A paper describes a structure:
Merbecoviruses from bats, pangolins, and hedgehogs pose significant zoonotic threats, with a limited understanding of receptor binding by their spike (S) proteins. Spike (S) protein is the major viral surface glycoprotein of MERS-[name] and forms homotrimers. For the MERS-[name] S-trimer, NTD is known to mediate cell adsorption by binding sialic acid, while RBD is known to bind the human dipeptidyl peptidase 4 (hDPP4) as the entry receptor. The S2 subunit mediates membrane fusion and exhibits a higher level of sequence conservation among CoVs.
In addition, S-trimer structures of six merbecoviruses from different animal species were determined. Different from previous MERS-[name] and MERSr-[name] PDF-2180 (31) S-trimer structures, densities that can be modeled as linoleic acids (LA) were identified in RBDs of most of the currently reported S-trimer structures, with CN-HedgehogCoV-locked-2 S-trimer being the only exception. Consequently, the identified fatty acid–bound 3-RBD “down” conformations for the merbecovirus S-trimers are also designated as locked conformations. In the characterized merbecovirus S-trimer structures, the putative LA carboxylate group interacts with a serine from a neighboring RBD via hydrogen bonds. Overall, based on structural and sequence analyses, the sialic acid–binding pockets in GD-[name], HKU25-[name], and Japan-[name] show considerable conservation compared to MERS-[name]. However, Loop-N2 in these S-proteins is incompletely resolved, suggesting that further investigation is needed to confirm their sialic acid–binding capacity. Among our determined MERS-[name] S-protein structures, receptors for Japan-[name], CN-HedgehogCoV, and EU-HedgehogCoV remain unidentified. The comparison of their RBD structures with MERS-[name]-RBD shows that the four conserved hydrophobic residues are either substituted with nonhydrophobic amino acids or displaced in position. To date, Japan-[name] (HKU5-HKU25 clade), CN-HedgehogCoV, and EU-HedgehogCoV (SA-[name]-HedgehogCoV clade) have not been shown to bind ACE2.
Author numbering:
A (entry chain B): 784 to 907, 914 to 1125
B (entry chain A): 1028 to 1167, 1176 to 1218
C (entry chain A): 344 to 678, 700 to 737, 747 to 783
D (entry chain B): 50 to 92
E (entry chain C): 1028 to 1076
F (entry chain A): 930 to 978
C-alpha cells in the first residue's frame, strides 16, 4: 500500500478582515499597508491557480482510452468487487468504489461545507473559524464523483498485450488471462500456471480480503494519509490561532484597546497588532507556496507511478512493490 | 525585495531623511531602530525563500539531466514518461530558466477490430506451438501476422514467431499450416 | 471602488484591466446595530471614609476597595484641583467611560513640592521607605489640591520617613510595592521640631523622618488608583457609564453590541442550552473569550463572534461580464438571479444544463462559468467516457490495431 | 488532584467542557498538611 | 539558532539581567516583551526551516 | 555562469548526436547512421513492421 499526495487544501485570506476584524480605526491605520495586503491576496490567488492547473494535469494524464467491464462472472475466479462501484450504493457518491469508501470513512476529516457552511455554522473548530478569522477554504476543482470516475476507469483499462510492448493497441483480454501472462512474465512456466489456476485465484482473493481490513494504526500509508490531513489542519490552526497574539499590546482584540486607552496609545497598540498580523500572513503565504510546489512535484510522481504500475507491468524490482510486480490498482484518497 | 523598503513598520515614515528632519535624537533612534528591525527580518525571509528556491531548482536540474539521458540520448520503452504513447525521438532546446523538450511520439488515429489468437499448434505428437513477437496472429481459417502498432497482415514465418510450450488456449490448426509449424 | 465587487477588484489590483478569473474580494461585513444592556440596580460606592476624617501620611496610607457599586466620578473630581496625573495601561477618559471589576484607591496627605519623589524611577526617601507604586494592574497616580477646607479636615502637618534601618544605614529596610513600611510602628509616633528619630530597644529598629507644616494653605493629596478587568461577575461603573437596559429577545441572530454587567463587546446572541455555572454569569472558552451568558430573565444566551459572508467575483475580461459567488451560503441569507450551486449562492449566472470540456473560470465541484457571445453561463466539466470493449467468449480475442497514424509533439 | 482537592474556582467566570491550564494558588500534590482534633471536656 | 539570542531587537541589551539591573519596572516589561517577541518570531522561522 | 551562446552550443550538439545502434543496447559505440534510418529503426521498435 502506497499513498502519494497530489494536492493540498486551497486557502485564501481576506487580509483586511484578518488584520482588523472590521474596525474602522484599524482600517484607517491599515490604509498605509494596503499594498502588502494586496500582495498577500495576489500571491494566494496565484498559488491556488497553480494548484488547479496541477490537478487538471493529473486527471488529464491518467485518463484511459479503452475499458472493459469487470463484473462478477467475467473476471473468472478472481474477486475484484472490492475495486468496483457497489451495486447497492449508500456512499452518497454513485461512482465511489467500496475500497474508496473504506479509505475515506476511516480518515478523520472535518467537513468544510461548500454549500451551506455559513448557514450550518450560524445555526449551531477551524471550519467555523473561516467566517470569524477571515479566511476561506476553496473547494477542489473536481467533485469526488469525477475523481471516482477517473480512478475506477483505470481498473478495467484495456491495454496492449504482454508480448506487444507498447500502448498503440487495445487487446480485449480477460483479467484471468492478463494475470496469467503477468505471472508468466516474471519466470513461471505455462505448465505451473495451468496446473495452479484455482490456487492462484484463491491467493489473489485472500490478498484482496486482507487488503480490506488493513486500514488500521499499524498501517503506514494510512498514517501518511492522516499526516497530510493533519498538515492541512495544522496550517488552518496556525492561521486561526495567530490572531490571539498580543505582540506586546495590552490586548489581542481591538475593542479592548479602543475602550481602555486614549487616541495615541490606541494608534500605537493597533499598529503593533497590524505589524504582527502582517508578518504572520507573510509567513503563512510562504509556507503555502512551499507546500504547493511540493504537492505539484508529488502529483507528477503520482502520474509516473500510475503510468508505470497501473497501465503496465514493471520490470524494475522494488519500484512499484516488493519482489516481482504483478498488477497494481489505484483508488482515490484524501489529498492524493 | 524592492517593495519591502516602503514598509514604515509603525514609524512615521519609511525614509530615514524624513525621520531625521522631523524628530529629535531619541525619537530618531527609536524610529530608525524600528526600520532596521523590520528590514532585517524581511532580509532573513528573503534569504530563506532563495535557499528553498535554489534547492528546488537543483533537484529539477537533476530531473532534467535524467530526462535528457532517457529521451534525447535514447528511446524510452516505458510509455508516458517522455511523451504520450510510443516515444520515437526527442529534441531539447535552451529555455530562459531551464530546458525545453519536444517529445515526438506515435499517435494512432484510426483503429479497426481484428480477431486475434494467442498461439497456433498442429496435431503432431511433440506439438510445437508458436507465439507472435511484438505482434498478433490475426485472421479474416487462415492466420496472418501483423505489427502491434499498425495493421498489416503478413505471412507467418520464423522471423516473427518464437517456439513456446503447448497451452489449452492455443488454436489447433489442421487444414492449413504456416512454415514454422510445417515439417 | 464601493459601487460593486468588480470595481473593488479593479481597485485592489490598482489597474483598469485585470485578467479573467475567480477573485476573492472583501467580505460582507455586518457592523453591529442594536444594543443589549443588562445591569443591576447596584448602590453608591461609599467614599465618605475619605472625607469624614483627617487624611493619613504617606507611610500610613489608607486603602479603599470598591466592588459591585456605582459612583459619581464627576462629583468626586469636582472637589479636587488636579495638578498632575500619570497613568499606566489605562487613561482617565477610559476610566470615566467604561466599567471595571474592582477599583482600589490609595490616598494620603502629600505635599506638592515633593511630586517628583512619587514618580516611576525615583530613588528618594518616599520611594524607598514610604510608598512604592505597584504596576501589576492598570494604575493612575493623581496628585491634587483640595480648595475648600470643609471637604476634608486639615491634618496638622505633612510627615514622611527619610530612612529606616536596624543597626546601621547599611541594613536599611526598603518598602515593597503596594505594601506598608517595616518602620510603621516607629513612624506612628510622628516627626516634629523636637522629634526627628525614633528607636526601639527590643528589636533594635530605628526610623528617621522629616516634616512640613500646614498653615492657612490648601490641602494637597495624592491618590494612587488601580482597576482590574474580568475578575468578577459584577462591575464598578461611573454613573456616566450607566445606560438604559434593553432586551436581547428582539436582536437574536445578528451582530449586536452588548454591555452585560459592565462587560462590553459585540457578538451574536442565540437562545442556547444552559451550560456552565449560573452564579458566575459568564462562560468563557480556553482563549479568554465570552461564549455564553446567564441572563436575569432565566434564559442562557450563547455569545458568538460576528461573522462575514465570503464574496468572490467571477470576472471575464473579453466579454466584460462579472458574476458574484457567495461562498458556502444559501440564497435566503443573501436576501440571472440568485441560485443555489454546490459551491454556494451565485448571482449573475444563467443555468442551461450546459456541459463543457475545458473552461477558464472554474468555480469548484466540477462547476465553471462559461462566457456566451450576454452573460456568463453556469456549466459543468465534462467527463469523456472511454471506449468500452467487451471480450468474446472463445479462445480468441479482439484487438484494436491502428490503420492510420500521426506524429504528436509533447 | 484527581478528586480536585483544595481547588479554588475562578472568581468571575466559569468554563464548560474544556481542560485549561490555570496559574493561581493551589495546594501541592501529596501534601499531608496539618491535622487538628477538637475534643470534649471531662464529664 | 544559537546566534539569534544576541539580537537586541531594539532593546538596550540582549540579556535580561542588564535590563533588570538598568531600568525600572515598566521599562523592564517593555524591553523584555520586545525580546520575547523577537525570540518567538525567530523560533517560528527556525521551525518552518 | 555560461553566456547563452555556450548553452545553445551545448543544446545544439545534442540534436546531431550519434549513438549506439538500436539493436545494440549501450553507449560504448558510435554508429554513424543517418537520421532517416535512425527514425526507421525507432519506428520499428514500437511495433511497426
Ligand atoms: C503594635 O503594638 C505595639 C505594642 O505592643 C506598638 O508599640 C508601642 O507603640 C507605642 C506608640 O508608638 C509606644 O509608646 C511610646 O513609648 C515611648 C517610649 O519608648 C514614649 O516615649 C512615647 O511617648 C510613647 O508612649 C510603645 O512604647 C510601643 N511598645 C512597644 C513594645 O513597642 C506598635 O506601635 C503597634 N503597631 C502599630 C503599627 O501601631
Ligand atoms: C453627580 O454629581 C453632580 C455634582 O458634581 C450632580 O450635579 C448636580 O446635581 C444637583 C441635583 O440634581 C443639582 O442641583 C446641581 O446643580 C448639579 N450640579 C452641580 C455642579 O452640583 C449630579 O446630579 C450627580 N449625578 C448623579 C447621578 O447623582
Ligand atoms: C494611620 O492613620 C489612621 C487614620 O487615617 C490612624 O487611625 C486612627 O488611630 C487613632 C489612634 O490609633 C484613633 O484614635 C483614630 O480614631 C483612628 N482613626 C481612623 C480614621 O482610623 C492610624 O492610627 C494610623 N496608623 C499609624 C500606624 O500611624
Ligand atoms: C464535550 O467535549 C467532548 C470533546 O469534544 C465532546 O465529545 C465529542 O462529541 C461529538 C459528538 O457531537 C463526537 O463526534 C466527538 O468525537 C467527541 N469527541 C471526543 C474527544 O470524544 C462532547 O460531546 C462534549 N459535550 C457536550 C455536552 O458538548
Ligand atoms: C541632585 C543631586 C546631585 C546630583 C549630582 C550627583 C550625583 C549624580 C549621581 C547619581 C544621581 C542618581 C539620582 C537621580 C535623581 C533623580 C530624582 C529623584 O530620585 O527624586
Ligand atoms: C467477493 O467478495 C465479497 C466481499 O468483498 C463477497 O461479498 C462476495 O461474495 C465474493 N464473491 C465471491 C464469488 O467469492
Ligand atoms: C476654612 O477657612 C475659613 C477662612 O476664613 C475659616 O473661616 C473656616 O473656619 C475654615 N473652616 C474650617 C473647618 O476650618
Ligand atoms: C432612559 O429612559 C428614560 C425614561 O425611562 C429616559 O428619560 C432617558 O432619556 C433614557 N435614556 C436614554 C439614553 O435613552
Ligand atoms: C429560550 O429557550 C428556553 C429553553 O432553553 C425556553 O424556555 C425559552 O422560552 C426560550 N426563549 C425564547 C425567547 O425563545
Ligand atoms: C439547472 O437546470 C436544470 C434543468 O431545469 C436542473 O436540473 C438543475 O438542477 C439546475 N441547476 C441549478 C444549479 O439550478
Ligand atoms: C461530453 O462527453 C461525452 C462523452 O462522455 C460526449 O459524448 C459529449 O459530446 C461531450 N460533450 C461536449 C460538449 O464535448
Ligand atoms: C490518414 O489520415 C490523414 C488525415 O486525415 C489522411 O490524409 C490519410 O489519407 C489517412 N490515411 C489512411 C491510410 O487512412
Amino acid at each position: 500500500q502506497e499513498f502519494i499526495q497530489t494536492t493540498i487544501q486551497k486557502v485564501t485570506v481576506d487580509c483586511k478582515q484578518y488584520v482588523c476584524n472590521g474596525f474602522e480605526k484599524c482600517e484607517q491605520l491599515l490604509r498605509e499597508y494596503g499594498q502588502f495586503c494586496a500582495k498577500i491576496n495576489q500571491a494566494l490567488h496565484g498559488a491556488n491557480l497553480r494548484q488547479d492547473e496541477s490537478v487538471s494535469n493529473l486527471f488529464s494524464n491518467i485518463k484511459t482510452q479503452a475499458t472493459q467491464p469487470l463484473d462478477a462472472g467475467l473476471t473468472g475466479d478472481f474477486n475484484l468487487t472490492l475495486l468496483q462501484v457497489p451495486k447497492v450504493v449508500t456512499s452518497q457518491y454513485s461512482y465511489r468504489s467500496a475500497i474508496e469508501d473504506l479509505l475515506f470513512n476511516k480518515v478523520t476529516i472535518a467537513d468544510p461545507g461548500y454549500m451551506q457552511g455559513y448557514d450550518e455554522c450560524m445555526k449551531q473548530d477551524l471550519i467555523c473559524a473561516q467566517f470569524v478569522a477571515g479566511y476561506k477554504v476553496l473547494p477542489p476543482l473536481y467533485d469526488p464523483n469525477m475523481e471516482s470516475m477517473y480512478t475506477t476507469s483505470l481498473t478495467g483499462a484495456i491495454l496492449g498485450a504482454a508480448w506487444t510492448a507498447g500502448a498503440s493497441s487495445f487487446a480485449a483480454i480477460p483479467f484471468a488471462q492478463s494475470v496469467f501472462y503477468r505471472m508468466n512474465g516474471i519466470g513461471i512456466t505455462q505448465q505451473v500456471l495451468s496446473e495452479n489456476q484455482k490456487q492462484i485465484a484463491n491467493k489473489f482473493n485472500q490478498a484482496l480480503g486482507a487488503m480490506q481490513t488493513g486500514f488500521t494504526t499499524t498501517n503506514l500509508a494510512f498514517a501518511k494519509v492522516q499526516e497530510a490531513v493533519n498538515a492541512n489542519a495544522q496550517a488552518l490552526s496556525k492561521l486561526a490561532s495567530e490572531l490571539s497574539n498580543t505582540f506586546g499590546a495590552i490586548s489581542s482584540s481591538i475593542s479592548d484597546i479602543l475602550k481602555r486607552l486614549d487616541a495615541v496609545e490606541q494608534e500605537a497598540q493597533i499598529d503593533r497588532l497590524i505589524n504582527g498580523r502582517l508578518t504572520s500572513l507573510n509567513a503563512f503565504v510562504a509556507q503555502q507556496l512551499v507546500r504547493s510546489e511540493t504537492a505539484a512535484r508529488s502529483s507528477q510522481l503520482a502520474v509516473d507511478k500510475v503510468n508505470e504500475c497501473v497501465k503496465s507491468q514493471s520490470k524494475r524490482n522494488g519500484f512499484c512493490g516488493s519482489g516481482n510486480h504483478i498488477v497494481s490498482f489505484v483508488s482515490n484518497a484524501p489529498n492524493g | 525585495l524592492a517593495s519591502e523598503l516602503s514598509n514604515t513598520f509603525g514609524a512615521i515614515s519609511s525614509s530615514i531623511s524624513d525621520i531625521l528632519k522631523r524628530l529629535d535624537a531619541v525619537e530618531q533612534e527609536a524610529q530608525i531602530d524600528r526600520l532596521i528591525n523590520g528590514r532585517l527580518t524581511s532580509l532573513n525571509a528573503f534569504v530563506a525563500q532563495q535557499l528553498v528556491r535554489s534547492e528546488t531548482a537543483a533537484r529539477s536540474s537533476q530531473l532534467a539531466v535524467d530526462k535528457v539521458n532517457e529521451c534525447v540520448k535514447s528511446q524510452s520503452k516505458r510509455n508516458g514518461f517522455c511523451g504520450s504513447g510510443n516515444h520515437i525521438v526527442s529534441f531539447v532546446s535552451n529555455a530562459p530558466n531551464g530546458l525545453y523538450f519536444f517529445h515526438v511520439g506515435y499517435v494512432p488515429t484510426a483503429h479497426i477490430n481484428a480477431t486475434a489468437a494467442y498461439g497456433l499448434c498442429n496435431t503432431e505428437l511433440p506439438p510445437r506451438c508458436i507465439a507472435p513477437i511484438d505482434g498478433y496472429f490475426v485472421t479474416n481459417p487462415e492466420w496472418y501476422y501483423t505489427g502491434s502498432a499498425f495493421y498489416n497482415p503478413e505471412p507467418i514465418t520464423l522471423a516473427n514467431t518464437r517456439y513456446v510450450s503447448k497451452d489449452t488456449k492455443y488454436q489447433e490448426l489442421n487444414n492449413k499450416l504456416p512454415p514454422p509449424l510445417l515439417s | 471602488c464601493g459601487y460593486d465587487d468588480v470595481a473593488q477588484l479593479f481597485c485592489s489590483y490598482e489597474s483598469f484591466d485585470v485578467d479573467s478569473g475567480v477573485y476573492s474580494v472583501s467580505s460582507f461585513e455586518a457592523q453591529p446595530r442594536g444594543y443589549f444592556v443588562e445591569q443591576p440596580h447596584s448602590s453608591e460606592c461609599d467614599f465618605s471614609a475619605m472625607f469624614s476624617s483627617q487624611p493619613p501620611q504617606v507611610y500610613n496610607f489608607s486603602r479603599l476597595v470598591f466592588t459591585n457599586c456605582n459612583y459619581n466620578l464627576t462629583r468626586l473630581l469636582s472637589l479636587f484641583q488636579v495638578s498632575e496625573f500619570s497613568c499606566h495601561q489605562v487613561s482617565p477618559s477610559a476610566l470615566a467611560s467604561g466599567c471595571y471589576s474592582s477599583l482600589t484607591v490609595d490616598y494620603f496627605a502629600y505635599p506638592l513640592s515633593m511630586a517628583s519623589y512619587l514618580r516611576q524611577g525615583s530613588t528618594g526617601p518616599i520611594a524607598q521607605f514610604n510608598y512604592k507604586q505597584d504596576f501589576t494592574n492598570p494604575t493612575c497616580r493623581i496628585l491634587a489640591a483640595v480648595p475648600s477646607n470643609v471637604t476634608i479636615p486639615l491634618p496638622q502637618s505633612y510627615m514622611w520617613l527619610t530612612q529606616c534601618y536596624t543597626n546601621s544605614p547599611s541594613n536599611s529596610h526598603y518598602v515593597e510595592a503596594g505594601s506598608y513600611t517595616p518602620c510603621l510602628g516607629l513612624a506612628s509616633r510622628g516627626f516634629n521640631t523636637f522629634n526627628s528619630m525614633h528607636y526601639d530597644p527590643a528589636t533594635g529598629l530605628t526610623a528617621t523622618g522629616s516634616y512640613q507644616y500646614i498653615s492657612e494653605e490648601a490641602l494637597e493629596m495624592a491618590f494612587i488608583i488601580s482597576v482590574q478587568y474580568g475578575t468578577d461577575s459584577n462591575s464598578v461603573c461611573p454613573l456616566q457609564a450607566v445606560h438604559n437596559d434593553t432586551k436581547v429577545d428582539d436582536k437574536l441572530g445578528r451582530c449586536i453590541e452588548y454591555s452585560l454587567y459592565g462587560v462590553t463587546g459585540r457578538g451574536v446572541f442565540q437562545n442556547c442550552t444552559p451550560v456552565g455555572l449560573k452564579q458566575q454569569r459568564f462562560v468563557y472558552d480556553g482563549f479568554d473569550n465570552l461564549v455564553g451568558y446567564h441572563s436575569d430573565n432565566g434564559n442562557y444566551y450563547c455569545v458568538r463572534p460576528c461573522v462575514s459572508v465570503p464574496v468572490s467575483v467571477i470576472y471575464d475580461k473579453a466579454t466584460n461580464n462579472h458574476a458574484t459567488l457567495f461562498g458556502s451560503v444559501a440564497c435566503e441569507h443573501v436576501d440571472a438571479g440568485p441560485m443555489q450551486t454546490s459551491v454556494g449562492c451565485v448571482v449573475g449566472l444563467v443555468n442551461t444544463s450546459l456541459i463543457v470540456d475545458n473552461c477558464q473560470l472554474p468555480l469548484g465541484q466540477s462547476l465553471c462559468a462559461v462566457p456566451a457571445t450576454s452573460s456568463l453561463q453556469l456549466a459543468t466539466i465534462n467527463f469523456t467516457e472511454p471506449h468500452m470493449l467487451t471480450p468474446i467468449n472463445s479462445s480468441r480475442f479482439i484487438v484494436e490495431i491502428p490503420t492510420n497514424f500521426s506524429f504528436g509533439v509533447t | 488532584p484527581l478528586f480536585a482537592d483544595g481547588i479554588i474556582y475562578p472568581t468571575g467566570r466559569s468554563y464548560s467542557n474544556i481542560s485549561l491550564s490555570y496559574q493561581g494558588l493551589f495546594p501541592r500534590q501529596g501534601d499531608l498538611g496539618r491535622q487538628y482534633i477538637y475534643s470534649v471536656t471531662h464529664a
